[PDB]
Structure formats: C-alpha cells, structure tokens
Amino acid sequence: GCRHVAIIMDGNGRWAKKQGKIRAFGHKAGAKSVRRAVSFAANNGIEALTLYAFFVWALDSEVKSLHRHNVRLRIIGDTSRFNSRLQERIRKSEALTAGNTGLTLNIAANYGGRWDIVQGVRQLAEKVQQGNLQPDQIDEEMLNQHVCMHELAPVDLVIRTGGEHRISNFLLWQIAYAELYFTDVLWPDFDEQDFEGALNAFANRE
C-alpha cells in the first residue's frame, strides 16, 4: 500500500572505484539505475517518487519521454541561484508535464530538509508581518501546507542505498511517519528486486 517512495541515491562513487573506473562512469551507471527505478515505480502504481542525489542536459534529453509516459516532473530545492537559462528549462519542463496524472517524479536539487522548513516559515512570517496572520494561529497543518510536496500523498517509505544509516538533511518534516529502509547495495546496483525488497519491508510493518 506504498504511495510515495523517497530515495537517497548513495554509492555512485564507491561503485566506480570498485569497478576500477573514474567517478563519471559511476554517474553514467547511476542515471541508468534512476531510469530503471522510475519505470519500476510507475509500473507498480506508486503515486510519487522523490529522488535525492547525494543534470544540465539530463533534463532536456529525458523530459519528452517522461511526458509521453504521463509523468509529472517537479524539482524541489533552492534553484534560485542556478543560472537563469537552467532555471528556465526547469520551469519549462515543469509546465509541460504539470497536468500529467501518472507518476509524480520529484528531483531534489540543492535541497535540504531544514531549508525546506525554513522556506515555509519565511512565508508565514511574511503573512504575520502584514497582519494577515496571528502567531498563535500557526499550527502543524498550516506549516505542513507550505513545505514541499504538501499536495502529494505522504512519504510512506524512505530508501537509502550505499550503507549509511542517516537522513543527511534530506526530507525531515515529511518523514515523521515514514518507513525507513537502509540497504548496503550501491545505487548503480539497486534494481527491481532491491526496490521490491524495500516495498515488502513497508508491507510487513503493517
């Protein structure tokens, strides 16, 4: 009954080094593993897939395919300091797919869980400053409404590949009740079997 999976994709670098290859080769294999995880999620009725790299062209090449697959693409994180061209391509890719009803694919870029919260806080603070909001009126529901992804199903499952047992300032507010699944498998090795293994762990919690 897994609706929203988030994944910390760790291990690209150690994978390259184990293969006796340069760091870039690990990334090439990482992108493959992303494609395969995105397909797996859409094929298995998962509503949202949120990915954290722990892109310049990765966007422009892959977007039309995602669109045709009825995938809704979103970038979460601080894109404000990205160059204005890349910001505009992100913007276009988002608007192109915004009406799609299949898998929502969130890519975290220059994202942090504390930053995420702070952005919502600044918004509420702005409302307070202009008299439209009393301090004592602020509650979890309200703050929940201006942290990223508040319009999607709650994060059910966090997967972290690569062996570390940490959130590392990924989603924080959102993972309050999420199943947390850690595997030593390196991200480029992470396949459909590993993904399903994580999904069952969620299943066997309940």
- Contact call for residue 58 and ligand 53Q (CB under 6 A): yes
Could you say which of 2, 8, 34, 41 contacts ligand 53Q (CB under 6 A)?
34
Please give the Cα distance from 152 to 203 (Å, whole number): 20
Helix (H, G, I), strand (E, B) or coil at 40: helix
Q: Which of 62, 142, 58, 56 is nearest to 96 (CA)?
A: 62
Q: Is 11 annotated as a binding residue?
A: yes
Q: Is 65 annotated as a binding residue?
A: no
Q: Would you tell me the crossing angle of helices 58-68 and 23-43 to the nearest 10 degrees?
A: 20
Please give the Cα distance from 3 to 163 (Å, whole number): 24
Interaction site with a copy of itself (CB under 8 A): 112-115, 117-118, 121-122, 124-126, 128-129, 133-136, 138-140, 143-144, 164-169, 172-173, 175-182, 201, 205
| 106 contacts 74 by C-beta, under 8 angstroms | yes
Which residue in 10, 116, 156, 194 is the catalytic one? Answer: 10
Stretch that binds ligand 53Q, among 26-34, 123-131, 143-151, 173-181 (CB under 6 A): 26-34
Q: Does 10 participate in catalysis according to the annotation?
A: yes
| 26 contacts 189 by C-beta, under 8 angstroms | no
Question: Closest approach of Cβ 105 to ligand 53Q, in Å?
Answer: 7
Please give the Cα distance from 165 to 65 (Å, whole number): 34
> Residue 112: enclosing H or E segment and its boundaries?
none
* 179, interface contact from a copy of itself, ligand 53Q, none, CB < 5-8 Å by kind: a copy of itself
Q: Judging by beta carbons within 10 Å of its beta carbon (0-12, 13-18, 19+), is residue 11 exposed, middle or buried? A: buried
Please give the Cα distance from 38 to 30 (Å, whole number): 12
Q: Is 78 annotated as a binding residue?
A: no
Binding mask 5-24 for ligand 53Q (x = CB under 6 A): -------x------------
* 58, interface contact from a copy of itself, ligand 53Q, none, CB < 5-8 Å by kind: ligand 53Q
* 178, interface contact from a copy of itself, ligand 53Q, none, CB < 5-8 Å by kind: a copy of itself
Residues that bind ligand 53Q (CB under 6 A): 12, 27, 30-31, 34, 51, 53, 55, 57-59, 61-62, 107
Known binding residues for substrate? 10-15, 23, 27, 160, 166-168
